[PDB]
């Protein structure tokens, strides 16, 4: 028994007043909380009144399963008009994140062997380990200068400079010297450019180019100015590596981008495009869940202890061969799966379905936008018993339950790189320090394309020596 599409519960809010409030509020900060509240009132499935196109919202893994079967050769995501507009204007190609169809497949297949593949992970993992080591060592130096052998600080700036340092070394094979040193003007500008880029995305996301072009021209100006800065930073990296490789082909591994340039399977302008997305992509996406794991470990000392015991046992083997960290730290990997469950990076998994399907016994026609709301999915007390409870052990009992990086062929390209940056930092921090905090109040998240914390709590790093 299958019900028609219009039989599905509808969102009570209308598209026009929705447009008007973003113009008034300069963004959609609360979106995650608003959508979560809607699911509690209308059920695990509802249709959004987009006024013509079909838009469906889901929050169940059983829906994610069915959504993967309809993926096809070319899984299609909604076109992100503000980002694409910048590429067209400046004459740049689109990377694997913004592409669709056969153009996406060509790029993706030529990127997987050097960005995501296990053989590639074995090569960039020891590089990331060196950065992660330097972070803990630099921290230990400042901790031992205090009488109590502890340092209480806002970790957010330092963690952000780690994700910049670790990503640049993994991608380009260049140490920027940000870990253990004062932040560079160039890095601070890049971070702010990203901050502004995401802010302006939300404002321009919901309305057509036609409307936004005269209603919000200064939002458009602000968005492009932010991208001009992001692109300036990324192009500087690409110009350095291209000149270095033009004069000498190295025998040893010197980063992800180096491998892509040497293989030359993709055009320079496509390597430039994809490398830009990997450079800008890896900063905020890796740092925010790293910061949230640190907070949740500071909150749950009992959980921390188990993870510390695991990391101190596997310390000797990871010191000799860093690539072991993946296989020898199941609890820490499960702690990361837990952090991403409670605190997702984005909010929606998008799919513009290629053929008809049945979701929650409702008919879903072809060309329907299906959005998987990750914030709500992580909170279902039937699938994730005690959902408010930060318990990594839950992942070792168990399927489409864990899906923060997505699914199928379109599933996150940086997934393995992000995992390595997170694992290795936490491993070295747990080895030498005890994280603590008096802030036991949950941090309020802010929707600015990337679901980011509104507060950065004070964390005490106490040395074990
Ligand atoms: C650790 C947190 C991260 C999460 C949760 C995450 C999650 C996601 C999700 C859900 C997708 C799309 C999956 C889909 O639609 O099927 C995705 C795509 C992508 N991510 Fe991330 N990501 C993370 C880190 C990274 C990092 C560090 C980078 C930069 C290297 C990155 C680069 C990308 C790219 C290029 C894509 C596009 C994949 C494609 O269209 O083929 N991500 N990410
Ligand atoms: C629902 C999960 C999700 O999409 N998270 C976030 C959304 C914000 C951007 C993003 C990226 C990404 C960020 C910036 C650029 Cl330039 C890019 F090219 C890709 C990669 N990976 C995850 C995510």
Swiss-Prot record:
The keyword Iron applies. It catalyses: a steroid + 2 reduced [adrenodoxin] + O2 + 2 H(+) = an 11beta-hydroxysteroid + 2 oxidized [adrenodoxin] + H2O; 21-hydroxyprogesterone + 2 reduced [adrenodoxin] + O2 + 2 H(+) = corticosterone + 2 oxidized [adrenodoxin] + H2O; corticosterone + 2 reduced [adrenodoxin] + O2 + 2 H(+) = 18-hydroxycorticosterone + 2 oxidized [adrenodoxin] + H2O; 18-hydroxycorticosterone + 2 reduced [adrenodoxin] + O2 + 2 H(+) = aldosterone + 2 oxidized [adrenodoxin] + 2 H2O. It is a peripheral membrane protein. Heme binds at residue 412. Keywords: Disease variant, Heme, Iron, Lipid metabolism, Membrane, Metal-binding, Mitochondrion, Mitochondrion inner membrane, Monooxygenase, Oxidoreductase, Steroid metabolism, Steroidogenesis, Transit peptide. This is Cytochrome P450 11B2, mitochondrial. Belongs to the cytochrome P450 family. One of its GO terms (molecular function) is corticosterone 18-monooxygenase activity. Disulfide bonds: none annotated. Changing residue 152 to I: In CMO-2 deficiency. Its cofactor is heme. Expressed sporadically in the zona glomerulosa (zG) of the adrenal cortex (conventional zonation), as well as in aldosterone-producing cell clusters (APCCs) composed of morphological zG cells in contact with the capsule (variegated zonation). A cytochrome P450 monooxygenase that catalyzes the biosynthesis of aldosterone, the main mineralocorticoid in the human body responsible for salt and water homeostasis, thus involved in blood pressure regulation, arterial hypertension, and the development of heart failure. GO terms for biological process: aldosterone biosynthetic process; C21-steroid hormone biosynthetic process; cellular response to hormone stimulus; cellular response to peptide hormone stimulus; cellular response to potassium ion; cholesterol metabolic process; cortisol biosynthetic process; cortisol metabolic process. Gene3D superfamilies: Cytochrome P450. The gene is CYP11B2. It comes from the Eukaryota. Signal peptide: none annotated. GO terms for cellular component: mitochondrial inner membrane; mitochondrion. Induction: Expression is induced by angiotensin II, potassium (K+), and also by cAMP. It is linked to Corticosterone methyloxidase 1 deficiency: Autosomal recessive disorder of aldosterone biosynthesis. There are two biochemically different forms of selective aldosterone deficiency be termed corticosterone methyloxidase (CMO) deficiency type 1 and type 2. In CMO-1 deficiency, aldosterone is undetectable in plasma, while its immediate precursor, 18-hydroxycorticosterone, is low or normal. Corticosterone methyloxidase 2 deficiency: Autosomal recessive disorder of aldosterone biosynthesis. In CMO-2 deficiency, aldosterone can be low or normal, but at the expense of increased secretion of 18-hydroxycorticosterone. Consequently, patients have a greatly increased ratio of 18-hydroxycorticosterone to aldosterone and a low ratio of corticosterone to 18-hydroxycorticosterone in serum. Expressed in aldosterone-secreting tumors and in adrenal glands of patients with idiopathic hyperaldosteronism. Its EC number is 1.14.15.5, 1.14.15.4. Pathway: Steroid biosynthesis. It is found in: Mitochondrion inner membrane. Pfam families: p450.
């Amino acid at each position: 028994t299958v019900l028609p599409f219009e039989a599905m519960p509808q969102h009570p809010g209308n598209r026009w007043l929705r447009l008007l409030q973003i113009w008034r509020e300069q963004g959609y900060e609360h979106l995650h909380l608003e959508m979560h509240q809607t699911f509690q009132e209308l059920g695990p499935i509802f249709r959004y009144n987009l006024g013509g196109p079909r838009m469906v919202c889901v929050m169940l893994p059983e829906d994610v399963e069915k959504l993967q079967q309809v993926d096809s050769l070319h899984p299609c995501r909604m076109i992100l008009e503000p980002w694409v507009a910048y590429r067209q204007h400046r004459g740049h190609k689109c990377g694997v994140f913004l592409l669709n169809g056969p153009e996406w497949r060509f790029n993706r297949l030529r990127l997987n062997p050097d960005v995501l593949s296990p053989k590639a992970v074995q090569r960039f993992l020891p590089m990331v380990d060196a950065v992660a080591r330097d972070f803990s060592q630099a921290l230990k130096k400042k901790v031992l200068q205090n009488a109590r052998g502890s340092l209480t600080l806002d970790v957010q700036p330092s963690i952000f400079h780690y994700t910049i340092e670790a990503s640049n070394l993994a991608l380009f094979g260049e140490r920027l010297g940000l870990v253990g040193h004062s932040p560079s003007s160039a890095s601070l500008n890049f971070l702010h450019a990203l901050e502004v880029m995401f802010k302006s995305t939300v404002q321009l996301m919901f309305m057509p180019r036609s409307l936004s072009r005269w209603i919000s021209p200064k939002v458009w100006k602000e968005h492009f100015e932010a991208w001009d800065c992001i692109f300036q930073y990324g192009d500087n990296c690409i110009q350095k590596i291209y000149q270095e490789l033009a004069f000498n082909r190295p025998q040893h591994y010197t980063g992800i981008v180096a491998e892509l340039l040497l293989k030359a399977e993709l055009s320079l302008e496509a390597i430039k495009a994809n490398s830009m997305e990997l450079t800008a992509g890896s900063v905020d996406t890796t740092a925010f869940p790293l910061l949230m794991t640190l907070f949740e470990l500071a909150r749950n000392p009992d959980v921390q202890q188990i993870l510390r015991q695991e990391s101190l046992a596997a310390a000797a083997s990871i010191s000799e061969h860093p690539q072991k960290a993946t296989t020898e730290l199941p609890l820490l990997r499960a702690a990361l799966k837990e952090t991403l469950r409670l605190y997702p990076v984005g909010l929606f998994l998008e799919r513009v379905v290629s053929s008809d399907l049945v979701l929650q016994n409702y008919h879903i026609p072809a060309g329907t936008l299906v959005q998987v709301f990750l914030y709500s999915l992580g909170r279902n007390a039937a699938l994730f018993p005690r959902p408010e409870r930060y318990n990594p052990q839950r992942w070792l009992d168990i399927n489409f339950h864990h899906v923060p990086f997505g699914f199928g062929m379109r599933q996150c390209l940086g997934r393995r790189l992000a995992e390595a940056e997170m694992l290795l930092l936490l491993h070295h921090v747990l080895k030498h320090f005890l994280v603590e905090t008096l802030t036991q109040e949950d941090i309020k998240m802010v929707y600015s394309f990337i679901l980011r914390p509104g507060t950065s709590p004070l964390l005490t790093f106490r040395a074990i020596n």
